[PDB]
Design a protein around this nucleic acid. Structure first.
Lengths: 62, 102, 74, 151, 138, 179, 68, 98, 129
RNA sequence: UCCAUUGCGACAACGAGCGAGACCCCGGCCGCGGGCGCCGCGGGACGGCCCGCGGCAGCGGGAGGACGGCGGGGCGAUAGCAGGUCUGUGAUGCCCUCAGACGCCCUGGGCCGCACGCGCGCUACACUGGCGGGGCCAGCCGGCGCCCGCCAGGACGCGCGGAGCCCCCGCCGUGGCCGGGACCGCGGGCUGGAACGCCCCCGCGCACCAGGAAUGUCUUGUAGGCGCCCGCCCCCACCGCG
């Protein structure tokens, strides 16, 4: 099911080309868990993302 | 003067060193002499003897330098001499970056 | 390939007009695909259909003539 | 056609009181207002008839922003020379707005017409300079170079 | 002003029809089998082309006001590009003999005057251009 | 737009796309050089109809021809209004909203599925609708305008027939598989 | 994206350590006017002079707002 | 009688003083206001290289020619008096006309 | 609407649907070197108008067509301009090649060796020959 | 930290210098004057201001304003490369020829010869088009008139004078077709002492229906589309520089 999840902070982009940004997403529509979610495309804080498969969390571990 | 001095076969370093002195005495802060060719050898080389600091680029270079090119002739072949003299005190103005702050 | 009409519609022309009138809107090229007329023929018969006033040209352009039947409301 | 004494040479007498300009993309326009019946003409052609027929709305934006009262008394004569078709419609809009501003410039009311027009459309009052760049050797354009054969 | 208020192309098409009925121009024999311009390889299919062109030359002369410019200047106004070449396309002027044969015909009918150099709209002709514009206005 | 179709009640229904969409700041006719290429996200503040009219001017040929494009989306808009009895701009906002694909498998060899930003979905939705028309406006009888409008109506519904919808679903397809 | 060169920084710092009283903390133009005096300092060009003045208005704010 | 005067200077600075001198000598003879002819730009673009080897770098050489408009209503001897009076700076174009 | 199908002029097949100007655009390929309406369409064209055109094409300098607008302009046999189509273009092109073969000429040798005659770069753009 | 040996901070370094930058050329803006000609001289922008963050250098947003944070150029250190040019020259060594000259002129040919491979281009593949009847706006910056001629051009005098694209309206109608114009055959001009050059008119109607491995250049007035000018020119640009 599509879920609504806004950015909490826009972290530095990885992807080896800098293309995919890192964003933290709190399901404003529910329990608000701030899981990190990788994003392709220009993004700024508070841009809602409608997808949230929720079977994946981003990797920002160094 | 250098090209004709070089003809009498004086030392090439001494020639430049004497010319370098008379420009600095006349006031030029920057003096540059480069003689290039088959000097004392069958191979090409360039011998830069320089006394002082010379600007080498930009609009000041156009009005604050005195580059003069002459082509000496020699039995070995042409050994052109190039002399560039830089005067910050050109009396036409000041160096664009020279802040007097006195 | 496509059928060049040769402006051949005679007895068939009246039924061709009947379908065009039934359709809510018509464009010069829409007829040519739906019934294989040249789009040039489509302008020919459409000029007669608008002459009656069956259709109303929303807009005329050198290439696109947009017609919606003013009638068919009844 | 380029910034000559053409600005005032077109009209002798019939003195216009308010002068205004609108210039973008080398297309320069000089607008002269006699404040008569409010009608606007550009290059001898009435503003309601503009050669691009879709771009009559772009030209009639200053007029669309304010009410009929502002243009009820402002008679504008405009003269656009040079540039191009689209640079001429863009120029017209800038000149008409300089003309309304010049009518109410002394009062603080100049601010009202500058805010309303600019908020609806930027460059209605201002003129974006964006001039053309210069071809450099090794290319057919400023940002375009010829295809490199090897490597 | 008057004709200038009228869309020039609308005025040109309507006046060309009037000139034919009014007997102005009376197209020559060569104009039926000729293609205007060194750029255009196809003749006009209008069949009233020498009248539509003749509204363009006299109304453009009205636009001259006092210029007294010639036939080549008008030919440039109706010019377009030559194609059909591997080399890129370049603008080629209109054929002068057609343009010469309408400006001379207009002056011959006294609708134009040869003051100096080329031609400017004659006062007798000036009424004609304004007259038709007034008919278009209503 | 074209002295018609006011955006009085025209609005987005998808929240994320609404943040990057313009349904209010529209100058009369889809023109005006506002330098919406400047800064970063100036696209959001740019009239969607201009964004659509700018997409049409592409693939060489019609390059830079905004006026021809402006009158072409005007011809398509009138076709849209007449076919659906609906303000074209409302159908347009829905068409470019549904078309944008929410899941794309970039490389991140292997590929990984990554969520798509609302701006990218806004730009892909406009782009796909034009290409869906451009491809179906080649050696065919229907004019570019009739395809652009055909594409728009199905895209609002979500019907796969629209090239934009099929590409969106194929994008989200290879994304699900390469999760 | 504007980082000053040593010459601009050095000239500006002599201007502040000497004519601190002439300079004003937030306005570049008053500081530019002090640079324009010429008796205080010789500044060749308009851009060079503006850069020395601009750093000197930041320096003026900074020296009032704590030691520099 | 009014005499046309045209001055052509390659260097703007060298003609700049000449135009200032032109007013300060012919003020009594009512010299015309100094309209400046639009610059005539003589431009030559030449390949920098003696050969054609290397990248095709181009050396652009430009000589800008400046001209000023002057008219003096004075006697035949009086123009000659101003011609001697005006500041003489080398390499300048001097024009006496009717 | 009145329609007629294919017609034949000078042993060519003519499509009735196309406009008369397009219908005649090629006669036997080598044909298009009038009194009828050119927009009527080949099917709409009458037998009588075609007969007038048949006279026009056979004798062009009889109805106001010019000398310049002719296919041939100075001949090599009569010295006079004429309009020839169908087999005659083929017979005169053969005759013109045969005249170029007759005497030795650069025009003769190239037409045989199939090299472009009057053309320039045979080095890089005659490939596939 | 910058973009930058750009800075800041600390230190067996302490002071410099050259390159960077600065300057310069243009532009957009605002005055002061001048007139045959919009062109002479100045100011205007500096990371100043606001807010956060950092010793700091500065960083990222805002504003205010033509213009905002390396324009769009020129000049480009040091040390070099046996890179290229002796065929640009009264630059030149060594060298070669030198009176049947490797001197110079005069004539005719060649560089443009073509089974083929490749590099830079130009025109295509159509209807977001061809057709072509009108409207109409350029900039580096600039001449026309009158007749004769389908044109091409020409005669005759004089100082003059401006695109395409696009815009509207027809038309053709998805057909290698009304796309494309390569080749060919008659002619009509031009330039020169001479075509073997170019231009034009009637023909003629090749591939080509979107291009494989590969690849090439680009981020605002930018790519692309679209015209025009000059250079070298007797003629001639699918070229170069603009």
């Amino acid at each position: 099911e599509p879920i609504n999840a806004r950015v909490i902070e826009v972290l530095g982009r990885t992807s080896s080309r800098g293309g995919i940004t890192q964003v933290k997403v709190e399901f404003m529509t529910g329990e608000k868990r701030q899981i990190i979610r990788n994003v392709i495309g220009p993004v700024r804080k508070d841009d809602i993302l409608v997808l949230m498969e929720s079977e994946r969390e981003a990797r920002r571990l160094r | 003067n250098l090209r004709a001095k070089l003809e009498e076969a004086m030392p090439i370093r001494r020639a430049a060193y004497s010319i370098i002195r008379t420009a600095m005495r006349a006031g030029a802060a920057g003096c540059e002499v480069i003689v290039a060719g088959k000097l004392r050898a069958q191979r090409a080389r360039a011998n830069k003897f320089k006394e002082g600091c010379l600007i080498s680029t930009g609009h000041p270079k156009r009005i604050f330098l005195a580059e003069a090119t002459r082509h000496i002739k020699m039995r070995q072949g042409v050994i052109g001499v190039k002399v560039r003299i830089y005067n910050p005190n050109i009396r036409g103005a000041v160096m664009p970056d020279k802040i007097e702050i006195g | 390939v496509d059928y060049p009409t040769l402006f051949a519609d005679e007895a068939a022309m009246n039924e061709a007009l009947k379908f065009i009138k039934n359709s809510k809107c018509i464009t010069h090229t829409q007829i040519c695909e739906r019934l294989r007329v040249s789009v040039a023929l489509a302008k020919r018969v459409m000029r007669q259909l608008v002459k009656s006033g069956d259709f109303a040209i929303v807009s005329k352009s050198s290439r696109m003539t947009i017609f919606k039947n003013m009638t068919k409301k009844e | 056609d380029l910034l000559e004494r053409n600005d005032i040479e077109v009209r002798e007498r019939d003195k216009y009181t308010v002068h205004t300009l609108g210039k973008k993309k080398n297309s320069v326009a000089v607008a002269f207002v006699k404040a008569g019946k409010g009608d606007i003409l550009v290059n001898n052609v009435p503003l309601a008839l503009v050669r691009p027929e879709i771009l009559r709305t772009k030209v009639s934006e200053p007029i669309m922003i304010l009410g009929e009262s502002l243009f009820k008394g402002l008679d504008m004569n405009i003269k656009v020379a040079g540039g191009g078709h689209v640079s001429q419609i863009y120029a017209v809009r800038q000149a008409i707005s300089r003309g309304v501003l010049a009518s109410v410039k002394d009062e603080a009311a100049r601010s009202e017409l500058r805010a309303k027009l600019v908020s609806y459309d930027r460059q209605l009052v201002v003129s974006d300079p964006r001039r053309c760049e210069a071809k450099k050797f090794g290319g057919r354009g400023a940002r375009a170079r010829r295809q490199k054969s090897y490597r | 002003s008057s004709v200038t208020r009228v869309p020039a192309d609308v005025f040109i098409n309507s006046f060309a029809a009037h000139l034919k009925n009014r007997g102005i121009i009376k197209c020559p024999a060569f104009t039926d089998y000729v293609k205007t311009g060194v750029s255009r390889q196809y003749a006009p299919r209008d069949a009233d082309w020498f009248y539509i062109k003749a509204a363009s030359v006299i109304r453009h002369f009205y636009i001259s006001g006092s210029h007294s410019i010639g036939v080549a200047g008008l030919a440039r106004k109706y010019s377009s590009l030559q194609k059909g070449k591997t080399t890129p396309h370049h603008t080629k002027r209109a054929s002068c003999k057609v343009i010469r044969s309408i400006v001379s015909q207009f002056l011959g009918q006294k609708l134009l005057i040869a003051g100096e150099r080329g031609r400017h709209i004659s006062p007798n002709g000036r009424k004609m251009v304004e007259d038709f514009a007034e008919g278009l206005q209503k | 737009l074209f002295n018609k179709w006011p955006l009085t009640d025209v609005k987005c229904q998808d929240e994320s796309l609404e943040a990057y969409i313009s349904i209010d700041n529209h100058s009369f006719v889809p023109h005006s050089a506002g330098r919406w290429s400047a800064k970063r996200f100036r696209k959001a503040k740019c009239p969607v109809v201009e964004r659509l009219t700018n997409s049409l001017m592409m693939h060489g040929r019609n390059s830079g021809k905004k006026l021809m494009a402006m009158k072409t989306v005007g011809e398509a808009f009138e076709l849209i209004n007449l076919y659906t009895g609906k303000n074209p701009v409302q159908v347009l906002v829905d068409a470019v909203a549904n078309s944008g694909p929410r899941e794309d498998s970039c490389r991140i060899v292997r590929r990984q599925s990554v969520d798509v930003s609302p701006l990218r979905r806004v730009n892909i939705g406009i782009y796909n609708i034009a290409t869906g028309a451009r491809k179906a406006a080649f050696r065919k009888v229907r004019p570019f305008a009739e395809c652009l409008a055909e594409e728009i109506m199905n895209a609002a519904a979500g019907a796969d027939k629209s090239y934009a919808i099929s590409q969106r679903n194929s994008v989200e397809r290879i994304a699900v598989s390469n999760r | 994206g504007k980082v000053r060169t040593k010459t601009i920084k050095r000239a500006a710092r002599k201007i502040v350590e000497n004519n601190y009283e002439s300079l004003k903390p937030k306005d570049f133009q008053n500081n530019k006017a002090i640079c324009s005096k010429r008796n205080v300092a010789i500044i060749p060009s308009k851009r060079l002079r503006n850069k020395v003045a601009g750093y000197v208005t930041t320096l003026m704010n900074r020296v009032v707002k704590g030691p520099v | 009688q009014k005499y046309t005067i045209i001055v052509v200077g390659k260097d703007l600075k060298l003609v700049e003083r000449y135009v200032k001198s032109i007013v300060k000598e012919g003020r009594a003879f009512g010299i015309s206001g100094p309209c400046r002819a639009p610059v005539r730009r003589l431009t030559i673009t030449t390949r920098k290289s003696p050969c054609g080897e290397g990248t095709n770098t181009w050396h652009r050489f430009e000589l800008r020619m400046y001209k000023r408009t002057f008219w003096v209503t004075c006697g035949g001897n009086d123009i000659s008096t101003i011609l001697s009076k005006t500041v003489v700076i080398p390499g300048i174009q001097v024009t006496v006309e009717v | 609407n009145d329609y007629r199908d294919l017609l034949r002029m000078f042993n060519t097949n003519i499509q009735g649907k196309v406009v008369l100007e397009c219908a005649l655009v090629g006669i036997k390929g080598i044909g298009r070197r009038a009194n009828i309406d050119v927009h009527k369409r080949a099917g709409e064209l009458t037998a009588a108008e075609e007969d007038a055109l048949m006279k026009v094409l056979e004798d062009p300098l009889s109805h106001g067509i010019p000398a310049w607008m002719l296919n041939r302009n100075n001949d090599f046999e009569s010295g006079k301009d004429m309009h020839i189509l169908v087999n005659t273009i083929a017979s005169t092109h053969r005759a013109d090649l045969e005249r170029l073969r007759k005497t030795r000429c650069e025009r003769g040798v190239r037409h045989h060796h199939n090299l472009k005659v009057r053309g320039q770069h045979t080095k890089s753009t005659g490939r596939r020959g």
